Amino acid sequence: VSQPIKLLVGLANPGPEYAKTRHNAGAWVVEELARIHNVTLKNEPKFFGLTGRLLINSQELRVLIPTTFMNLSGKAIAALANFYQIKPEEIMVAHNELDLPPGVAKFKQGGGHGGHNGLKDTISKLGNNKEFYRLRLGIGHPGHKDKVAGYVLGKAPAKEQECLDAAVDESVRCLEILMKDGLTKAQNRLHTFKAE
Amino acid sequence: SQPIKLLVGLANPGPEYAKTRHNAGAWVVEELARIHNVTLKNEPKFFGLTGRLLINSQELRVLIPTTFMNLSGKAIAALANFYQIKPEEIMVAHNELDLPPGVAKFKQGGGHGGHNGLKDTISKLGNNKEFYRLRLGIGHPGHKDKVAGYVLGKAPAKEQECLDAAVDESVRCLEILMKDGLTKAQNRLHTFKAE
Numbered sequence: 427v428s429q430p431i432k433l434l435v436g437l438a439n440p441g442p443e444y445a446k447t448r449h450n451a452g453a454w455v456v457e458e459l460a461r462i463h464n465v466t467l468k469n470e471p472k473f474f475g476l477t478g479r480l481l482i483n484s485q486e487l488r489v490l491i492p493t494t495f496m497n498l499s500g501k502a503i504a505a506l507a508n509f510y511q512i513k514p515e516e517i518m519v520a521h522n523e524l525d526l527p528p529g530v531a532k533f534k535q536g537g538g539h540g541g542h543n544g545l546k547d548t549i550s551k552l553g554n555n556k557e558f559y560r561l562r563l564g565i566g567h568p569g570h571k572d573k574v575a576g577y578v579l580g581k582a583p584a585k586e587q588e589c590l591d592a593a594v595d596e597s598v599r600c601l602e603i604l605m606k607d608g609l610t611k612a613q614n615r616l617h618t619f620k621a622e
Numbered sequence: 623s624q625p626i627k628l629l630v631g632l633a634n635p636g637p638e639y640a641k642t643r644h645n646a647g648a649w650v651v652e653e654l655a656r657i658h659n660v661t662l663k664n665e666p667k668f669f670g671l672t673g674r675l676l677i678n679s680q681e682l683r684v685l686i687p688t689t690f691m692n693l694s695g696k697a698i699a700a701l702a703n704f705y706q707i708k709p710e711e712i713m714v715a716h717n718e719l720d721l722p723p724g725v726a727k728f729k730q731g732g733g734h735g736g737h738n739g740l741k742d743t744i745s746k747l748g749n750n751k752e753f754y755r756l757r758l759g760i761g762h763p764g765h766k767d768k769v770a771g772y773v774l775g776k777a778p779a780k781e782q783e784c785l786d787a788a789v790d791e792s793v794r795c796l797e798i799l800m801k802d803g804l805t806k807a808q809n810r811l812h813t814f815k816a817e
Contacts, residue, residue, distance in 0.1 A: 441774030445638040471767040495738050495770045497692040543690050572666040575690045576635035 428608030431559060432516040433488050434459070434601070435503055437544040439579070440493040449578040451563040451590065452520035452544075453491045459598045460489055467491060473509070474502040482605035488512075492544075499544040500551025507552075514552045518559040520597070521545060522578060526564025529589030529621030531597045533604075533613045534560045541574055559609075561601070563593055592621035624803045626754065627711040628683050629654070629796065630698055632739040634774075635688040644739075644773040646758040647715030648686045649789045654796055655684055662686065668704070669697035678801040683707075694739040695746025702747070709747045713754040715792070716740060717773060721759030724784035724816030726792045728808045729755045736769060756792055760785065787816035 436456030439449055446454075460467055460478050467476035467489065475492040488510060492502030507517060515535070521542060526532065536556040539545035549556050566586075568577035582590055596619045604612035631651030634644060655662055655673055662671035662684070670687040683705065687697035702712060713728075716737055721727065731752045734740035744751050761781075763772040777785055791814045799807035 439774060440771035442638060442642055443775055447638055469767070471765065474767055493767065493771055495692065497690070497738055498770075543692060570666065572669055572688070575693070576688055579634055579636045579639055579690075581638060 428610070429485065429604055429612075430516055430609070431518045431604065432486065432512045433490060433503075433507055433510075433518065435490045435492070435499075435517060435519045435548075437496065437499055437519060437521045437542075438491055439496050445581055446587065447579050448522050448565040448582055448590075449496065451522040451565060451594070452561070454591075454594045455520040455561060455563065455597050455601070456489050456491055458594055459601055462598065465489065469493070473506040474498075475506075477506065482602060485605055487605065497543040497547050500547035500549070503548050504551040514555040514558045517552075518561055519545065519548060520561035520563060522565045523562035524565060524567040524574070524578075526562060527566050527589075528564055528582060528586045529593050530564040531593045531600075531619065532562045532564075532617055533600075533609065534562060536560075561597060563590070563597060565590065589621040593619070596621075624680070624799055625711055626682065626713045626799065626804075628685065628698075628702060628705070628707045628713070629756075630694075630712060630714045630743075631684070631686045632691065632694050632714060632716045632737075632743075633686050633688075634691050639774070641776045642774050643717050643760040643777055643785075644691060646717035646760055646785065646789070647756065649785075650715045650756060650758065650792050650796070651684050651686050653789055654793050657793065660684075664688070665701075668701045669693075670701070672701065677797055680800040682796075682800065692738040692742050695742035695744075698743050699746040709750040709753040711753075712747075713756055714740065714743060715756035715758060717760040718755075718757035719760065719762040719769065719773075721757060722761050722784075723759055723777065723781050724788050725759040726788045726795075726814065727757045727812055728795075728804065729757055756796075758785070758788060758792065784816040788814070791816075 436453035438453030465478040470477045474494045478489045492499045600616040631648035633648035660673040795811040
């Protein structure tokens, strides 16, 4: 109506403390959306993550950043969406996307996990359903297969982190636009964005 | 005479993860390899860094996977299968929640203990749990739900000293294992407690 989304999830590793690693991109979007809407994300052990509720254009939007292992992110998502009776196609998972360069971002419903250990676990723990939405935040692709974990668990160099941060900012605006004008208008704005 | 042909040190790859508790097992391998002057080689077919050490004239292969921790079994199984090494001949070094910092133990078998690396290693080794472990105590946080954050954090300095002493003693005992065998290695290691 015309925006089906009730849960926004931001995937990230629960540490280290010290580092803005590419694998945590999704969480940066949820943190910035929350900050802007004065939501304080609170630990909620029952959902194995940090949670909040926003109200945007009078639509309730729950937010989650799992604090499980990345490969058990599905446990957090399913625990909360079961609790509040949110369906898979009502969930949007924001995550780092190897298929797009730094500074680009896209909305999509369904698809594969693309080697993303969080996405893969989410599909499984949602009863093998891929039709949840994704917010794909581009981080570039290292080249090789075997180098993928080292890439995603590394810190983007500073100029590249700017592109990422710009895409986080636009993705938040487009999430707001999504809550106000629906999914199609939101995508149509976000997919023509390109950092700086 | 002793059962171990492959020593694995579980680890997340990269500089940001190198000093995290979840990497304790790689500290053991990296220190053993430094002492024996071997530079680990990246072998993409094995999803990790690997070497061969000569210790008391035994051959010990070493491996530190550079996959996600939860895909550690890919590296171990690819290497084990290549070199024809069975699970009972593999020692996996890993951070152990149920033991305090400053303590380390050898063990054969058991479950994964929530450790996502151990879990995948069991699965990729055909659901065989009977590989040896070098359990490196890192303690646990007060709440179950903090465990991932705990292991992916760096131990504070005093605590890291205990960890480093236990890495060092584990290395000495791995050398003893190769000279005097498991029972003697184990008797020595299991009376160690860094204070």
